[PDB]
């Protein structure tokens, strides 16, 4: 009473309560319920951050201003604090003493209305443990008789599990559906809140910046709902303008200042959200060629799909891109993916399809249903995309995957969303999908049996038609056919590996001078046609890292460097040179 | 009308409370919704609207402006989706019969198994049917329910097992949006 | 030097608390070590003895002489245990390659697959190696982790919803001890 209940009309006269914008439809339903003879206790049901308490608090603002109907005039909204009231009891009858006193005040004033924020708390354990004298039971007969009016607020999750268990209490409280507002509604809402936030931070928010906050936040921040989300990014921008400026800097909050704060919220490097990253995308094709040279047709294809996705031409609900890297091993089919993530500055996700070969393995990706082991785990695929909405997804050896796994990917390409065991929608339309398979390579290299060789140009594509179902292939944006490495391309790969070893040791102070003869020998032994260039890292480790590492700790190689590798023609072995 | 309509449409509440809720709420609407030119009496039309708001679907407003929407529903769908006119006729006629009052009263508005090749309009007519009617789309991808144990996700786990409080996705979704289009894509995969 | 050996040998607290503690501990010890004499200056060998007490490890191992022990690793194992001389010598050369700093640092330092008849001291070299290097010993028998459900225990307990402090069996041991040998037995039957 004295401190448990805080009046909202008196507060509204001073301020504090923000004004309501674009909620006449929801308000009209509440007023209709409040005017009822009995069970005049509306309940605002809505997701988190959807203005659940902005309508109750704003109702008081309307009453003071006078927008409410005449019947609702002269009514006072009371905001009950269950924590404060319940705190300090330390007795069996202290709660009922203060609680009944509160009802006595409301019962005396027929026009008084009560607002109980987070009403789900009382149903679980209001004021009793190991007993049955709860707070809800005390108000059950009063609400049934219409003596007092109570306004409640609880989320859908706390409404189906906690609420509705005691049908008696649910009967008295009517339910008003609250829906997340559209983008056009929120931008108008922020305009009304601009004077309060601007005066608080002593800054100005440009109209263009407000529209960019709701748009960028929705794409890069999916966990929180749009209304509270837009307020956080807008309010956070003003805080930066208070500390970063040294003195008399620009008060206006431009679009560039919003892109930085929203980037930190999403844990991104600010390159994607920023509009000044076009330079990276313009030269993305050339940059990848230096990192992963060869098969330029494969690299340019990715840049074209990525450019349109970031140019406003991306699909409305499909992913940024779905590709099937059908090619041999050792042609950097996976290297192009890991390097692409570094260019775009996004997380990399790798899944081994070989593990998902049995029929029951698909459950691990989407989680186990309720009532079975693994239900607590959300799912490897669903938790990864949800944790990192902007990330690259790699699925290697997709051909070995069970058909049950292929079915999961069908919805991913067409709708861009995958549901999990808990019902969370995995909205990952921003992640690029890349798959690697070696299905058709066998027919390309292998000639047709018989004295006469048939045309095998289309035989490789035919194999993909039988392995992959038509619906799966239709959803793919494009198929990137890699080509075998040429004699000159392989020689450059040897230089790439040596550069990593050379630069790794150059900082330590050990110079490396590999002879051309050694580079050629490593290429043949390191690159197998069947296994690709994967053994290059292995042979390089045993041939170079093993001997140099031993002498690094003890011997002359610890300092001075002057290492010169060579190859002898008599035995074809690689000689080693060490000096101080 | 309030007693009969409440039983037919309002659910999860008993008849005395249900009938008295429509009668009480109807008094506040007629008394407070019109600022002027108020209606002293409460006719059957008002009770239907109140029941419709509680249950989310109307029963006598079909000959209102919504009447024109049903006429252009078939033509509008044809513009967005070309060909396969026989499928649009089935959906538009089923809705008309249900809205007109010729429904089964014990079965859904319609149950149609659209079968055909890939990319011919199976998952487009349904997506474009909700937008035209302005109702929520309950999209369910059956590719996830590959095993028999996945049925628990639809109707929740039984008592005494993990995930019991979570509930069913299909049941909770329909309860939240009773008026909606239920789409079970790739039902054969389940 | 204090910060490098503190975080590695103590393996109890975090890096910032260790440095402030050892510095304060070192000053107190040297301040009252002799009855009359005193040493205003400090040395690395002096503070090393202090870390031995809180770490419960001999001062010789606590000393920053990893290269010395690594150089005579074979001589130490051959002197402490007898037999399998050829097997022990091969292991020392490989470990030296990882500690040199070459290769990718993110990759694990230890890639060794022991394969031989039991009872010849195969287990003894794993504990002797850890005792010499100072790292802890974590034994995880694969035979217990045979059932498919048991595999999940390594990542997390099945019913441990309230108990998130323990976490996965393998993960918690590695998290608490970042410098310790992992001994997997009967890995073939998994």
């Amino acid at each position: 009473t004295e401190n448990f209940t805080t009046n909202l009309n008196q507060l509204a006269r001073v301020g504090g309560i923000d004004p309501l914008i674009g909620r006449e439809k929801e308000l009209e339903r509440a007023i209709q319920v409040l005017c009822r003879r009995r069970k005049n206790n509306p309940l605002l049901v809505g997701e988190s951050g959807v203005g659940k308490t902005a309508i109750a608090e704003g109702l008081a603002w309307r009453i003071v201003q006078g927008d409410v109907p005449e019947v609702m005039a002269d009514c006072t909204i009371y905001s009950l604090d269950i924590g404060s009231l319940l705190a300090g009891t330390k007795y069996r009858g202290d709660f009922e003493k203060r609680f009944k006193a509160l009802l006595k005040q409301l019962e005396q004033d027929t026009n008084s209305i009560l607002f109980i924020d987070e009403i789900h708390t009382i149903i679980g354990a209001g004021a009793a443990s190991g007993g049955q004298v709860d707070a809800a039971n005390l108000i059950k007969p009063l609400l049934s008789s219409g003596k007092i009016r109570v306004i409640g607020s609880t989320t859908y999750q706390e409404f189906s599990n906690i609420f509705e268990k005691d049908r008696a209490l649910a009967r008295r409280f009517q339910k008003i559906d609250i829906t997340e507002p559209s983008i056009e509604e929120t931008v108008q809402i922020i305009n009304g809140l601009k004077p309060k936030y601007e005066a608080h931070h002593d800054v100005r928010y440009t109209a263009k910046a407000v529209r960019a906050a709701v748009e960028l936040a929705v794409k890069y921040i999916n966990d929180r709902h749009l209304p509270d989300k837009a307020i956080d990014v807008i309010d956070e921008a003003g805080a930066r303008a208070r500390l970063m400026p040294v003195s008399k800097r620009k008060k206006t909050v431009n679009v560039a200042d919003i892109e930085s704060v929203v980037a930190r919220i999403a844990r991104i490097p600010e390159k994607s959200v920023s509009q000044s990253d076009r330079d990276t995308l313009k030269n993305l094709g050339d940059r990848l060629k230096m990192l992963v040279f060869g098969q330029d047709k494969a690299i340019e294809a990715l840049t074209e799909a990525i450019k349109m996705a970031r140019a406003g031409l991306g699909h409305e609900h499909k992913p940024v891109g779905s590709f099937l890297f059908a090619g041999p091993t050792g042609v950097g089919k996976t290297e192009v993916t890991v390097q692409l993530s570094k260019a775009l500055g996004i997380e990399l996700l790798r899944f081994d399809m070989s593990e998902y070969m049995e029929r029951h393995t698909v459950s691990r990706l989407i989680g186990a249903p309720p009532g079975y082991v693994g239900f607590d785990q959300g799912g490897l695929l669903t938790d990864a995309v949800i944790k990192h909405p902007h990330a690259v997804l790699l699925l290697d050896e997709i051909e070995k995957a069970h058909p049950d796994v292929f079915n999961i990917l069908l919805q991913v390409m067409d709708n861009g969303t995958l549901t999990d065991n808990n019902g969370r929608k995995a909205d990952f339309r921003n992640v690029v999908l890349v798959m690697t398979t070696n299905a058709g390579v066998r027919e390309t290299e292998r000639k047709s049996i018989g004295l006469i060789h048939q045309d095998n140009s289309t035989d490789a594509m035919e194999e993909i038609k039988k392995i992959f179902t038509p619906e799966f292939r239709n959803r793919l944006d494009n198929i990137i056919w890699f080509d075998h490495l040429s004699t000159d391309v392989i020689h450059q790969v040897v230089d790439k590996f040596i550069v990593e070893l050379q630069v790794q040791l150059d900082q330590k102070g050990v110079s490396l001078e590999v002879s051309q003869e050694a580079r050629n020998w490593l290429a043949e032994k390191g690159y197998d046609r069947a296994m690709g260039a994967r053994p290059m890292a292995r042979v390089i480790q045993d041939n170079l890292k093993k001997p140099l590492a031993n002498e690094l700790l003890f011997g002359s190689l610890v300092d001075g460097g002057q290492v010169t590798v060579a190859l002898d023609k008599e035995k074809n072995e690689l000689t080693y040179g060490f000096q101080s | 009308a309030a007693v009969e309509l409440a039983v037919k449409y309002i659910n999860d509440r008993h008849l005395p409370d249900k009938a008295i809720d429509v009668i009480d709420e109807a008094g506040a609407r007629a008394r407070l919704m019109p600022v002027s030119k108020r209606k002293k009496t409460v006719n059957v039309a008002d009770i239907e609207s109140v029941v419709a708001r509680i249950a989310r679907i109307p029963e006598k407003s079909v000959s209102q402006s919504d009447r024109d929407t049903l006429k252009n529903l078939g033509d509008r769908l044809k513009m967005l989706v070309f060909g396969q006119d026989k499928a649009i006729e089935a959906l538009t006629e089923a809705i008309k019969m249900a809205r007109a009052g010729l429904g089964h009263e014990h079965k859904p508005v319609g149950s149609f198994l659209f079968a055909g090749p890939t990319g011919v309009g199976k998952t487009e007519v349904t997506v474009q049917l909700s937008k035209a009617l302005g109702i929520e789309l309950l999209r369910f991808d059956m590719s996830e329910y590959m095993e028999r144990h996945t049925v628990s996700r639809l109707i929740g786990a039984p008592p005494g097992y993990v995930g019991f409080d979570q509930g069913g996705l299909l049941t909770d979704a329909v309860i939240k949006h009773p008026h909606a289009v239920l789409l079970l894509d790739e039902i054969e995969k389940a | 030097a204090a910060v490098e050996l503190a975080v590695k040998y103590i393996n109890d607290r975090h890096l910032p608390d260790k440095a402030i503690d050892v510095i304060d501990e070192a000053g107190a010890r040297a301040r009252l070590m002799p009855v009359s004499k005193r040493k205003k200056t400090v040395n690395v060998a002096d503070i090393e003895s202090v870390v031995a007490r809180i770490a419960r490890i001999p001062e010789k191992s606590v000393s920053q002489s990893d290269r010395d022990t690594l150089k005579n690793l074979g001589d130490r194992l051959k002197m402490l245990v007898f037999g399998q001389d050829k097997a022990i010598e091969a292991l020392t050369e490989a470990i030296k390659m990882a500690r040199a700093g070459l290769g990718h640092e993110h990759k694990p330092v230890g890639s060794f697959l022991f394969a031989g008849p039991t009872g010849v001291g195969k287990t003894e070299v794993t504990v002797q190696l850890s005792k010499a290097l100072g790292i802890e010993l974590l034994r995880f028998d694969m035979s217990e982790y045979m059932e498919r459900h048991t595999v999940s225990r390594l990542i997390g307990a099945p019913p441990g919803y309230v108990g998130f402090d323990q976490g996965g069996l393998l993960t918690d041991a590695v998290i608490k001890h970042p410098h310790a040998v992992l001994l997997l037995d009967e890995i073939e039957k998994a």
């Binding site: 443990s129 082991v373 239900f375 | 095993e147 097992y161 | -």
Partner: peptide, 25 residues
């Protein structure tokens, strides 16, 4: 089919204590 998993429910315990009074005189 994979085996099912059962989850237990633990009830918290909290009680109210009375208070005796002693008059000074």
């Amino acid at each position: 089919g994979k085996t099912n998993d059962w989850l237990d429910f633990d009830q918290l315990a909290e009680e109210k204590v009375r208070d005796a009074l002693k008059p000074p005189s």
